[PDB]
Design an enzyme around this catalytic site. Structure first.
Site, mmCIF file in Angstrom:
data_model
loop_
_atom_site.group_PDB
_atom_site.id
_atom_site.type_symbol
_atom_site.label_atom_id
_atom_site.label_comp_id
_atom_site.label_asym_id
_atom_site.label_seq_id
_atom_site.Cartn_x
_atom_site.Cartn_y
_atom_site.Cartn_z
ATOM 1 N N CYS B 127 33.324 3.710 67.249
ATOM 2 C CA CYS B 127 32.806 4.674 66.339
ATOM 3 C C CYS B 127 31.645 4.313 65.237
ATOM 4 C CB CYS B 127 33.789 5.378 65.365
ATOM 5 S SG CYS B 127 34.967 4.266 64.487
ATOM 6 N N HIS B 251 32.442 8.683 59.009
ATOM 7 C CA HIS B 251 32.229 7.290 58.375
ATOM 8 C C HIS B 251 30.729 7.345 57.742
ATOM 9 C CE1 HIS B 251 35.491 5.861 60.496
ATOM 10 N NE2 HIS B 251 34.966 5.371 61.328
#
Ligand code: A2P
Ligand code: A2P
Ligand code: 3GQ
Ligand code: NA
Ligand code: NA
Ligand code: NA
Lengths: 357, 347
Positions: B127, B251
């Site tokens: 990710c 994130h």
């Protein structure tokens, strides 16, 4: 003993200033708590004694030997010069005097010697700068420092009591009342001085202080300029990114440096361990590294995740954590005052070097 | 259409894989939901239609055209080779196959061409690597990349649904019961697979995954290795610090690069704006920059705080944010499957 005044006694830093003073080696005959007109008349403890809070004014510093300021830059700009004129030695937490060449900018473990030449004001650096200086000075002493790149992970208590309560409220609205984070209403963060306000709950805000002309924030540029003054070396390259995260207390920093000479990694670790104010917390085999939640309440600065860069020969990464209201502010300040006492530097200044506003 | 299987359909990533497939342009004739022995029997939706969750076995993959794996290295190591055996094209979200020289590691906007060489298995990268690749590829194309240094600010959803719940419970104990953060009890974070566990509430944990011999974590080394492979250039120097913070989804990354040729900032901003999958959000005069809370639910990667280093001539800093369960995992995977369909590689 001394008469000691705390300017901004009611604030987030002020509360810790009181604790640090209560636990100090400073011989204190008399304590005075100063704040705005709003708090004047209210009362607050020093150990067991009830102390009545006073209004900060041009005339408030008569008989005061040492004043610790933590009431915002504007308050230091208005009143600190009057305290110096009255014969006070001021230890200022704010940014206002930090880059004035007549003002020492001090972290005692690093550059206590600069206190010798003070003219009535000593400045405490920004919280994020202080802990980075404690971690890196022992490295610099032995192998030099060519550059620093740092990304910060900053707690909300640095922006004051209001910011703390706003962060608490927001988390509670989300976790207890089911408000979505993007639906939250904010009034203070990322900066009380700026136009727009954003939720910090479940967020990471890459803005601390206002933006400067070069598209870095003032907080980023403070780290750059303060570093060079404290280490007395304008040749050290420093670029920062400063980010607010949902932490109430204790700043963490991902720090990258390149030394001037290759620094054996295990010696770097030893040097940091040996440096006063720095505690090595670095054992990855047992998942040992600095954490914000364990640093709260300690005056020490904690360093780990120490390792070579994968490609740069002189490159080193680390993780630095400290309580931003203690070594980051109140403790640095009181430590300065203790150092002034210990070295005979608590006395009125001959010449006034600060403009009265 | 196709018969599509979702392996690990009950998890945090699985749930988003379902949403992405539901919203996909992939012609789907039959959808099958696979999980563990103890999910096997319950019913999850696909649009308004009930799907019996089936146990994942060695023989459960016959008749499947495309399998999307999101159930940890363990599940993928064992059952994916059997799926390839049965003629299934596997898209793997896990780390297991990522460094296999016969397995493409793909971000479609960056190296879709790599899908052509596939041999039954496509690897979706980590990710935090994906959003970095989307933001940086346009700069690499035009001025080159000499090195990357990155510090991440990772949400808890990347460690599973269990991590999300542990985070919300920890925060409630602090804020409602007055428990001190250092006294909280933790079961999962920083790493479900490591010996000791720590609270994340009001904390920042400098450990994602477990440690390696060189004292970087596996998360940090994945960023380094996957970058080299996705950009097909081993000369790009990459070092990472990966930190978990108290964010549920999305994130963020503080990214430092040095280019090979000096890259004017306004041209850099324009190149990122022009790049598919990257959105420029960068207007500091109006305090506009990417924020985790605004990125949740979007497939795009958001880039801002773009500025040159104060000293290094070719140095550039930026801030990159994306939903870690979407572009970071489920959307990347479904985008791979769509790309395979469109390029006629599902066979
Ligand atoms: N004009 C002023 N003069 C003196 N102190 C001030 C003034 N404005 C604010 N302060 C003080 O600065 C501190 C701000 O702390 P924080 O940012 O943590 O709230 C408080 O002690 C506050 O006092 P008061 O509480 O009387 O407003
Ligand atoms: N041995 C296994 N075989 C198949 N699926 C598994 C296995 N172990 C875990 N999973 C699945 O991986 C996913 C992990 O989700 P998360 O990481 O969000 O916790 C879940 O869908 C879980 O399904 P299950 O619900 O049956 O455990
Ligand atoms: O006066 C402020 O508004 C302030 C608030 C938080 C931190 C600082 C600082 O520079 O350390 C400052 C500051 O002294 O500029
Ligand atoms: Na030490
Ligand atoms: Na290179
Ligand atoms: Na774009």
């Amino acid at each position: 003993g001394y008469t000691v005044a705390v300017v901004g006694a009611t604030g987030a830093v002020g509360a810790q200033m009181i604790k640090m003073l209560e636990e100090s080696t400073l011989p204190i005959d008399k304590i005075r708590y100063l704040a705005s007109a709003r708090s004047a008349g209210k009362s607050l403890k020093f150990k067991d004694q009830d102390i009545t809070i006073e209004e900060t004014t041009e005339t408030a510093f008569e008989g005061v030997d040492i004043a610790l300021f933590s009431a915002g830059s504007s308050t230091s700009a208005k009143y600190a010069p009057y305290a110096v004129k009255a014969g006070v030695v001021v230890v200022d937490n704010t940014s206002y005097f930090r880059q004035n060449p007549d003002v020492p900018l001090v972290v005692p473990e690093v550059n206590a010697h600069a206190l010798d030449a003070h003219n009535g004001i000593i400045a405490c650096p920004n919280c994020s700068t202080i802990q980075m200086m404690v971690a890196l000075e022992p490295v610099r002493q032995k192998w030099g420092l060519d550059r620093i790149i740092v990304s910060t992970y900053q707690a909300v208590s640095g922006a004051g009591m209001g910011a703390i309560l706003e962060t608490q409220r927001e988390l509670r609205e989300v976790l207890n009342d089911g408000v979505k984070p993007c639906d939250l209403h904010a009034e203070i963060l990322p900066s009380g001085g700026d136009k727009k306000h954003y939720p910090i709950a479940f967020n990471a805000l890459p803005q601390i202080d206002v933006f400067t002309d070069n598209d870095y924030t003032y907080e980023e540029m403070k780290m750059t300029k303060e570093t060079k003054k404290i280490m007395e070396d304008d040749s050290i390259a420093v670029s920062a990114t400063c980010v607010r995260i949902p932490v109430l207390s204790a700043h963490s920093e991902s720090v990258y440096i390149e030394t001037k000479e290759v620094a054996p990694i295990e010696e770097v670790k030893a040097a940091i361990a040996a440096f006063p104010g720095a505690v090595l917390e670095d054992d990855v085999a047992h998942q040992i590294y600095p954490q914000a939640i364990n640093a709260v309440g300690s005056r020490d600065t904690f360093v780990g995740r120490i390792r070579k860069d994968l490609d740069a020969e002189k490159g080193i990464h680390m993780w630095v954590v400290s309580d931003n209201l203690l070594k980051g502010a109140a403790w640095n300040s009181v430590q300065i005052a203790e150092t002034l006492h210990e070295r005979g530097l608590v006395r009125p200044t001959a010449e006034l070097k600060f403009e009265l506003k």
